[PDB]
Design a protein around this ligand. Sequence first.
Ligand SMILES: Nc1ncnc2c1ncn2[C@@H]1O[C@H](COP(=O)(O)OP(=O)(O)OP(=O)(O)O)[C@@H](O)[C@H]1O
Ligand SMILES: [Mg+2]
Length: 229
Amino acid sequence: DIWPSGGQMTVKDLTAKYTEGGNAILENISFSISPGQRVGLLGRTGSGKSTLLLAFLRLLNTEGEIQIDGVSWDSITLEQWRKAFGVIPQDVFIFSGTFRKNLDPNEQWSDQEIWKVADEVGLRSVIEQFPGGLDFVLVDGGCVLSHGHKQLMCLARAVLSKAKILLLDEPSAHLDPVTYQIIRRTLKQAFADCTVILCEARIEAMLECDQFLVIEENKVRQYDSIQKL
Ligand SMILES: Nc1ncnc2c1ncn2[C@@H]1O[C@H](COP(=O)(O)OP(=O)(O)OP(=O)(O)O)[C@@H](O)[C@H]1O
Ligand SMILES: [Mg+2]
């Protein structure tokens, strides 16, 4: 009895735009996703791959209904909706606090449960080099941390918040290969039964997906197999 529970996603007549009365990048988009399913979102450049991820996070002017595990996005807080998602890549917002608060903002885990997730995402050697380890306060954003380590923190932060839908926007080209490998390893351990929406521009970068979505013109066509995509 928790939310999000499985990662089932249902989109119905979704229309996204960047300004009030602007051009509809996506119009009347509707599909559905099974819990824990690896979904590949295919689309050429400028087709609207990034726009669909921004529409999921209510970061644009969106009309239509999206629901996760039966819970509509009109039925919870905006902050509680985005917490169900894990977003990579992104401009990582580092809290003005310790490594612990940045990894466990809600203070729901012990330092043993945090260090184990930190070891999986490859942040073990990055935290141990600071005096106090998890108690090292991160100030001025996270300037002491690399850009790739910030995304590992965002990845580890998503695991500790128990997100069920992981959004990946062209990780094969817009992430360091080391970072992509660590995420793919997380998808077989902590994120083993979580929904992953893989957005790429070439089919070769989304072979391991069970289902596929193609952004043809301003529509989204659905395919349940790679055979004749
Ligand atoms: N701030 C923005 N404001 C208005 N329109 C935008 C904005 N960002 C993207 N778009 C428009 O929305 C369309 C698709 O945008 P989007 O960036 O999501 O496609 P994309 O698949 O991510 O392409 P790419 O990643 O190669 O840049 C484009 O026609 C683009 O002009
Ligand atoms: Mg993009």
